[PDB]
Symmetry: C3
Subunit: 273 residues, 3 copies
């Protein structure tokens, strides 16, 4: 009932967003948006959720985030030696030592996290970026210059390697965000975007650039598909030849698939060799 | 006349740069260099300019920037929790809230911009880097861990996606900088360097690494070229086969070309599909 | 004798690491670990070393670093506008202006370096990351969003281009770290990881993703190899065709090899053309 009331305020405001402005926003509404941001930040709200074995999206959460961008004023952020200027608060500002201990997260300087992103215990953030609305479950490693984009869902024990990006999905509203399920390895410099889902136990090698337009070639079956890496897939960068053989175009290739039992026994290097 | 006098000081100093030093620089010259840096920073000077339909370069502006690197001393930059040490001032230091409002730029923490780069209103800098001499026109999105290199010219409404880089061109003096014209999309992890020009309305997909040595294959015509993406081109990563078929080498492929009318109607995803 | 005593303390502690903890660490041991960290930071210890023409690794140095991660407590790092939370000190904190001058390093804001990494004079760090245990020799350029990973050995006059990463190797203990020898060029967005060695005078082009599982095709000889770029190699991204020709998979291609005499005369662009 309480969340149904909060959702209602958000949806009615979003409906007439085209006649709202920073100078004209209900004080009760700016409070409501901040209530949703707080729930996203502490994990009690999450933008997408696996329900009855299906990933589902909560559009009203995206609407609250979209409304924060429209209605919140930019303010100076004073770093001493320089200034920034933005409207989205950072996650770790008034955080005490106890609170950091209780969180179980390591935030390596100078990793940057916006408020409205949840990050579970035993996660390590190397210098990296986590955007508003993201949900990072337990035991995740976010390596240097990686990016966890808006609303992205990162599962337990996922390894996002150096310079790898998980693309944000705030619009369209009905789109599932980019989802990396439990125990996935994302290799360095890869980029998984636009609501692609990488299912459980997958291994993505280096330089895999995977969006909704990227052909996925399954070399075992010979099928070409889009938008989903099935569970336990080993994925490498490849090419597909032209019809006349004059050239080839970039694609992702599924070179093997591995059950959970095997995934715990064989190393990533052996899987790619 | 006033700018012709300023240019003269810069050129005469640059001529005898090999006998200048940090301890021996005219006080009037360090002022002149700073006058050019100020004009670059507020957009009244720009390193390259489209004149009579041709992009042209102002070598004397590069010479001023080169002289700043030679003559300016490094100084401590105190970030409180650590120190840096460099000779190029940052753009946003003594900036007031009013000045940030007047600029119309959002500088998301912790985006870093050197002084001597111009950034026009309605631009959003995610955590990213903009180097000295760059010119970023109105409405540009610089996404997370993107880079706008020295002297780069970024047109209106350009989208530089996450982890994409626009390479700097300070030397050679006569070289046009890397130029991205109006309404271009630069896909994630791409890198456009070494004075390549991407003309108006082009769409560059992910993982396109494009420099002066990169073959550009036009699959419509079959031509191979270098250094220029014609207006309205859709560009993806590809390969070109060996003469004996033993291997292939990386290249960029122009897979379609689109007029301005079509460019506003069809989405980027549909263009790449 | 003094270093043999220090090594002994480290090795005996590492042996019974599984029964050590942050709350139970010898005060004399936390001092010993800090002595090794200091020696790594000032270059008097280095994790790997070329001895009698062979690169060798000092496992006990890695053990000290591993013990710092286990035993050092996380602490708040106060950046004023936000906080971080980590257990590894930064290299440049109490550094004076004189010390920065004496170091000969430029640390461009906001490049981040952990303590326990050595960086020699005439090196320039653009905003980038250098991890604990790395050794960066004289005259190196680390460009924007590059990464020098843990224990990596970077030779004199190496150029790590924008967005390029040198992968860390802390485990396995016996593995040589990723090694880039003198006068190598590492092109933008490339990633050299997992203890690959790039020998002297090599030129690596853009988008080269090179780990222990990456096939290296030598187009002059036709040989496929792993883990080593021989001295003077020019390396570009390529593909290798499927046995049935349905697809190809990513690889690195050695397209030329160049002696030291030629390497100083011919430009990188001419080498790749």
């Amino acid at each position: 009932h309480h969340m149904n009331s909060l959702q209602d305020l958000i949806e009615q405001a979003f409906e007439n967003r085209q006649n709202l402005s920073l100078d004209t926003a209900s004080s009760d509404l700016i409070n409501a948006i901040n209530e949703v941001l707080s729930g996203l930040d502490n994990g009690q709200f999450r933008v997408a959720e696996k329900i009855n074995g299906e990933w589902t999206v909560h559009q009203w959460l995206k609407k609250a985030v979209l409304l924060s961008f429209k209605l919140f004023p930019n303010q100076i952020i004073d770093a001493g030696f320089c200034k920034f200027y933005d409207k989205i608060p950072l996650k770790y500002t008034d955080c005490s030592n106890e609170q950091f201990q209780q969180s179980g997260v390591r935030v390596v300087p100078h990793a940057m996290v916006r408020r409205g992103a949840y990050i579970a215990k035993n996660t390590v953030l190397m210098p990296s970026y986590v955007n508003i609305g993201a949900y990072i479950d337990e035991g995740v490693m976010v390596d240097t210059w990686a990016t966890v984009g808006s609303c992205a869902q990162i599962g337990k024990n996922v390894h996002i390697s150096g310079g790898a990006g998980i693309g944000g999905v705030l619009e369209p509203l009905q789109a599932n965000p980019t989802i990396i399920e439990d125990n996935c390895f994302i290799g360095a410099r890869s980029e998984i975007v636009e609501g692609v889902i990488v299912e459980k136990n997958s291994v993505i090698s280096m330089g895999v650039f995977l969006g909704q337009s990227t052909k996925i070639y399954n070399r075992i079956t010979g099928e070409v598909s889009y938008g989903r890496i099935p569970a336990g897939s080993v994925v490498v960068a490849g090419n597909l030849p032209s019809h006349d053989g004059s050239h080839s175009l970039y694609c992702a290739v599924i070179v093997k698939q591995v059950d959970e039992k095997t995934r715990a026994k064989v190393s990533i290097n052996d899987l790619l060799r």
